[PDB]
């Protein structure tokens, strides 16, 4: 296993997301959503909320365990390693192809945040920004796709809606929501089994 930096993704995006058109743009959404879905499949969290923001960014929020908030080697947060090392993997690929990305983790009565810019360069460490009830847990990722890479940066509500509907059907007993702040459109999916 040869590890790589995020430059490898930026120099050959098609290798990681297939293309740099709308299909590729939406692959970024699928990668982050799949991380939330994997967590829910393991039994942590029963709702996943996706928001298309007015500024063109996209947020995915789950109510799972929260990404690990501890340290790797050299005092580097585990979350930084997940988002900045390519193990050629979704999180790092999305970060590499975003002009900015924020990850917010809630667990153990604390809310933590790390911000990356310009293809996944950290501009903060993982810092405690607030507190929450001990019962509150989860991960929220917001990213702005890099307009220098993609030929389109317009997320398509219908495309995402269809995917989340399908994901809700495969998961069972988990609510998937989509909200578009550009148009105010909103929908929720939930399939009981
Ligand atoms: C919005 C995107 N949503 C997202 O990305 N949510 C998300 C991601 C993760 C990842 N964690 C990892 C890695 F590598 F740190 F394990 C990769 S994704 C985990 C997670 C996975 N395994 C173990 C734990 C854990 N907490 N405590 C404990 O004992 O185990 C947590 C949970 N929620």
Short mmCIF file of N, CA and C in Angstrom, two decimals, residues 22-111:
data_model
loop_
_atom_site.label_atom_id
_atom_site.label_comp_id
_atom_site.label_asym_id
_atom_site.label_seq_id
_atom_site.Cartn_x
_atom_site.Cartn_y
_atom_site.Cartn_z
N UNK A 22 -20.83 16.71 -14.42
CA UNK A 22 -21.87 16.56 -13.41
C UNK A 22 -21.91 15.22 -12.71
N UNK A 23 -21.59 14.15 -13.43
CA UNK A 23 -21.49 12.82 -12.83
C UNK A 23 -20.42 12.82 -11.74
N UNK A 24 -19.25 13.37 -12.06
CA UNK A 24 -18.15 13.48 -11.10
C UNK A 24 -18.47 14.37 -9.92
N UNK A 25 -19.09 15.51 -10.19
CA UNK A 25 -19.52 16.43 -9.13
C UNK A 25 -20.40 15.70 -8.12
N UNK A 26 -21.35 14.94 -8.62
CA UNK A 26 -22.29 14.23 -7.75
C UNK A 26 -21.67 13.03 -7.04
N UNK A 27 -20.63 12.44 -7.64
CA UNK A 27 -19.85 11.40 -6.96
C UNK A 27 -19.29 11.88 -5.62
N UNK A 28 -18.98 13.17 -5.53
CA UNK A 28 -18.53 13.76 -4.26
C UNK A 28 -19.62 13.64 -3.20
N UNK A 29 -20.86 13.93 -3.59
CA UNK A 29 -22.00 13.79 -2.70
C UNK A 29 -22.14 12.34 -2.26
N UNK A 30 -22.05 11.42 -3.22
CA UNK A 30 -22.22 9.99 -2.92
C UNK A 30 -21.18 9.49 -1.92
N UNK A 31 -19.94 9.96 -2.03
CA UNK A 31 -18.87 9.52 -1.13
C UNK A 31 -19.17 9.89 0.32
N UNK A 32 -19.59 11.14 0.55
CA UNK A 32 -19.86 11.62 1.90
C UNK A 32 -21.14 10.98 2.44
N UNK A 33 -22.17 10.91 1.61
CA UNK A 33 -23.41 10.23 2.00
C UNK A 33 -23.15 8.76 2.36
N UNK A 34 -22.31 8.07 1.59
CA UNK A 34 -22.01 6.66 1.86
C UNK A 34 -21.34 6.46 3.22
N UNK A 35 -20.53 7.42 3.66
CA UNK A 35 -19.93 7.37 5.00
C UNK A 35 -21.01 7.44 6.09
N UNK A 36 -22.00 8.31 5.90
CA UNK A 36 -23.13 8.41 6.83
C UNK A 36 -23.99 7.15 6.78
N UNK A 37 -24.21 6.62 5.58
CA UNK A 37 -24.98 5.40 5.40
C UNK A 37 -24.29 4.19 6.05
N UNK A 38 -22.97 4.08 5.88
CA UNK A 38 -22.20 3.00 6.50
C UNK A 38 -22.35 3.03 8.02
N UNK A 39 -22.32 4.23 8.59
CA UNK A 39 -22.49 4.41 10.02
C UNK A 39 -23.89 3.98 10.48
N UNK A 40 -24.91 4.38 9.72
CA UNK A 40 -26.30 4.00 10.02
C UNK A 40 -26.52 2.49 9.86
N UNK A 41 -25.88 1.90 8.85
CA UNK A 41 -25.97 0.46 8.62
C UNK A 41 -25.40 -0.32 9.80
N UNK A 42 -24.35 0.22 10.42
CA UNK A 42 -23.76 -0.36 11.62
C UNK A 42 -24.61 -0.13 12.88
N UNK A 43 -25.70 0.62 12.75
CA UNK A 43 -26.67 0.81 13.82
C UNK A 43 -26.55 2.12 14.57
N UNK A 44 -25.78 3.06 14.03
CA UNK A 44 -25.56 4.35 14.68
C UNK A 44 -26.18 5.48 13.88
N UNK A 45 -27.29 6.01 14.39
CA UNK A 45 -28.00 7.11 13.75
C UNK A 45 -29.16 6.63 12.90
N UNK A 46 -30.28 7.34 12.98
CA UNK A 46 -31.47 6.97 12.20
C UNK A 46 -31.96 8.10 11.30
N UNK A 47 -31.13 9.12 11.10
CA UNK A 47 -31.43 10.12 10.08
C UNK A 47 -30.17 10.73 9.50
N UNK A 48 -30.22 10.98 8.20
CA UNK A 48 -29.11 11.57 7.47
C UNK A 48 -29.70 12.74 6.68
N UNK A 49 -29.23 13.95 6.98
CA UNK A 49 -29.77 15.16 6.37
C UNK A 49 -28.78 15.76 5.39
N UNK A 50 -29.24 15.98 4.16
CA UNK A 50 -28.42 16.59 3.12
C UNK A 50 -29.02 17.96 2.79
N UNK A 51 -28.16 18.97 2.71
CA UNK A 51 -28.60 20.32 2.39
C UNK A 51 -27.74 20.90 1.28
N UNK A 52 -28.39 21.39 0.23
CA UNK A 52 -27.73 22.14 -0.82
C UNK A 52 -27.83 23.60 -0.41
N UNK A 53 -26.70 24.20 -0.08
CA UNK A 53 -26.68 25.54 0.49
C UNK A 53 -26.72 26.61 -0.60
N UNK A 54 -27.10 27.83 -0.21
CA UNK A 54 -27.24 28.93 -1.17
C UNK A 54 -25.92 29.31 -1.85
N UNK A 55 -24.81 29.15 -1.13
CA UNK A 55 -23.49 29.50 -1.67
C UNK A 55 -22.91 28.47 -2.64
N UNK A 56 -23.62 27.36 -2.84
CA UNK A 56 -23.16 26.30 -3.75
C UNK A 56 -22.53 25.12 -3.04
N UNK A 57 -22.30 25.25 -1.73
CA UNK A 57 -21.74 24.16 -0.95
C UNK A 57 -22.82 23.13 -0.64
N UNK A 58 -22.40 21.97 -0.13
CA UNK A 58 -23.33 20.92 0.25
C UNK A 58 -22.96 20.37 1.61
N UNK A 59 -23.97 20.13 2.44
CA UNK A 59 -23.78 19.58 3.78
C UNK A 59 -24.43 18.20 3.88
N UNK A 60 -23.74 17.28 4.54
CA UNK A 60 -24.31 15.99 4.93
C UNK A 60 -24.12 15.88 6.43
N UNK A 61 -25.21 15.62 7.15
CA UNK A 61 -25.14 15.45 8.60
C UNK A 61 -25.74 14.12 9.03
N UNK A 62 -25.01 13.39 9.87
CA UNK A 62 -25.53 12.18 10.48
C UNK A 62 -25.55 12.32 12.00
N UNK A 63 -26.17 11.34 12.64
CA UNK A 63 -26.30 11.32 14.08
C UNK A 63 -25.72 10.01 14.61
N UNK A 64 -24.64 9.58 13.96
CA UNK A 64 -23.88 8.40 14.37
C UNK A 64 -22.94 8.72 15.52
N UNK A 65 -21.90 7.90 15.67
CA UNK A 65 -20.99 8.02 16.81
C UNK A 65 -20.13 9.29 16.79
N UNK A 66 -19.99 9.89 15.61
CA UNK A 66 -19.03 10.96 15.40
C UNK A 66 -17.71 10.33 15.03
N UNK A 67 -17.01 10.92 14.06
CA UNK A 67 -15.66 10.47 13.73
C UNK A 67 -14.79 10.53 14.98
N UNK A 68 -13.79 9.64 15.07
CA UNK A 68 -12.87 9.70 16.21
C UNK A 68 -12.24 11.08 16.37
N UNK A 69 -12.21 11.59 17.60
CA UNK A 69 -11.72 12.93 17.88
C UNK A 69 -10.29 12.92 18.44
N UNK A 70 -9.71 11.73 18.57
CA UNK A 70 -8.38 11.58 19.15
C UNK A 70 -7.25 11.91 18.20
N UNK A 71 -6.04 11.56 18.62
CA UNK A 71 -4.81 11.91 17.91
C UNK A 71 -4.19 10.70 17.22
N UNK A 72 -3.57 10.96 16.07
CA UNK A 72 -2.72 9.99 15.37
C UNK A 72 -1.28 10.27 15.83
N UNK A 73 -0.29 9.94 15.00
CA UNK A 73 1.11 10.28 15.29
C UNK A 73 1.34 11.79 15.25
N UNK A 74 2.34 12.25 16.00
CA UNK A 74 2.80 13.64 15.99
C UNK A 74 1.73 14.67 16.37
N UNK A 75 0.72 14.24 17.13
CA UNK A 75 -0.37 15.13 17.54
C UNK A 75 -1.32 15.53 16.42
N UNK A 76 -1.29 14.79 15.31
CA UNK A 76 -2.18 15.04 14.18
C UNK A 76 -3.52 14.36 14.46
N UNK A 77 -4.63 15.13 14.41
CA UNK A 77 -5.92 14.49 14.67
C UNK A 77 -6.22 13.35 13.70
N UNK A 78 -6.86 12.30 14.20
CA UNK A 78 -7.34 11.20 13.35
C UNK A 78 -8.17 11.71 12.17
N UNK A 79 -9.03 12.70 12.42
CA UNK A 79 -9.87 13.27 11.37
C UNK A 79 -9.03 13.92 10.26
N UNK A 80 -7.91 14.55 10.63
CA UNK A 80 -7.01 15.14 9.64
C UNK A 80 -6.39 14.06 8.75
N UNK A 81 -6.01 12.94 9.36
CA UNK A 81 -5.45 11.81 8.61
C UNK A 81 -6.48 11.25 7.61
N UNK A 82 -7.72 11.09 8.07
CA UNK A 82 -8.80 10.59 7.23
C UNK A 82 -9.05 11.50 6.02
N UNK A 83 -8.94 12.81 6.23
CA UNK A 83 -9.26 13.79 5.20
C UNK A 83 -8.08 14.25 4.33
N UNK A 84 -6.85 13.86 4.68
CA UNK A 84 -5.67 14.37 3.96
C UNK A 84 -4.71 13.31 3.42
N UNK A 85 -4.94 12.03 3.72
CA UNK A 85 -4.10 10.96 3.19
C UNK A 85 -4.93 10.05 2.29
N UNK A 86 -4.44 9.86 1.07
CA UNK A 86 -5.07 8.98 0.09
C UNK A 86 -4.51 7.58 0.27
N UNK A 87 -5.38 6.62 0.59
CA UNK A 87 -4.96 5.24 0.83
C UNK A 87 -5.12 4.36 -0.42
N UNK A 88 -4.81 4.93 -1.58
CA UNK A 88 -4.95 4.23 -2.86
C UNK A 88 -3.87 3.16 -3.01
N UNK A 89 -11.71 5.82 1.37
CA UNK A 89 -10.90 6.83 0.69
C UNK A 89 -11.75 8.03 0.25
N UNK A 90 -13.07 7.93 0.43
CA UNK A 90 -13.99 8.96 -0.03
C UNK A 90 -13.74 10.34 0.54
N UNK A 91 -13.51 10.41 1.86
CA UNK A 91 -13.36 11.69 2.54
C UNK A 91 -12.20 12.51 1.97
N UNK A 92 -11.04 11.86 1.80
CA UNK A 92 -9.85 12.54 1.30
C UNK A 92 -10.02 13.01 -0.15
N UNK A 93 -10.67 12.18 -0.97
CA UNK A 93 -10.94 12.52 -2.37
C UNK A 93 -11.85 13.76 -2.48
N UNK A 94 -12.89 13.80 -1.66
CA UNK A 94 -13.79 14.95 -1.66
C UNK A 94 -13.05 16.21 -1.21
N UNK A 95 -12.25 16.07 -0.15
CA UNK A 95 -11.47 17.18 0.37
C UNK A 95 -10.49 17.71 -0.69
N UNK A 96 -9.82 16.79 -1.38
CA UNK A 96 -8.87 17.14 -2.44
C UNK A 96 -9.50 17.97 -3.55
N UNK A 97 -10.76 17.68 -3.87
CA UNK A 97 -11.45 18.32 -4.99
C UNK A 97 -12.41 19.43 -4.55
N UNK A 98 -12.23 19.91 -3.32
CA UNK A 98 -13.03 21.01 -2.77
C UNK A 98 -12.17 22.24 -2.53
N UNK A 99 -12.71 23.42 -2.84
CA UNK A 99 -12.03 24.68 -2.52
C UNK A 99 -12.07 24.97 -1.02
N UNK A 100 -13.08 24.43 -0.33
CA UNK A 100 -13.04 24.33 1.13
C UNK A 100 -13.91 23.19 1.64
N UNK A 101 -13.58 22.72 2.84
CA UNK A 101 -14.32 21.65 3.49
C UNK A 101 -14.26 21.85 5.00
N UNK A 102 -15.40 21.68 5.66
CA UNK A 102 -15.48 21.73 7.12
C UNK A 102 -16.07 20.43 7.63
N UNK A 103 -15.45 19.87 8.67
CA UNK A 103 -16.00 18.71 9.37
C UNK A 103 -16.28 19.10 10.82
N UNK A 104 -17.51 18.84 11.26
CA UNK A 104 -17.93 19.10 12.63
C UNK A 104 -18.32 17.78 13.27
N UNK A 105 -17.72 17.49 14.42
CA UNK A 105 -17.97 16.24 15.14
C UNK A 105 -18.54 16.57 16.51
N UNK A 106 -19.62 15.89 16.87
CA UNK A 106 -20.23 16.04 18.18
C UNK A 106 -20.17 14.69 18.89
N UNK A 107 -19.60 14.69 20.08
CA UNK A 107 -19.58 13.51 20.95
C UNK A 107 -18.97 13.84 22.31
N UNK A 108 -19.35 13.05 23.32
CA UNK A 108 -18.79 13.17 24.67
C UNK A 108 -19.03 14.55 25.29
N UNK A 109 -20.11 15.21 24.87
CA UNK A 109 -20.48 16.52 25.40
C UNK A 109 -19.75 17.70 24.76
N UNK A 110 -19.03 17.43 23.67
CA UNK A 110 -18.23 18.45 22.99
C UNK A 110 -18.53 18.49 21.50
N UNK A 111 -18.35 19.67 20.92
CA UNK A 111 -18.47 19.87 19.48
C UNK A 111 -17.11 20.32 18.98
#
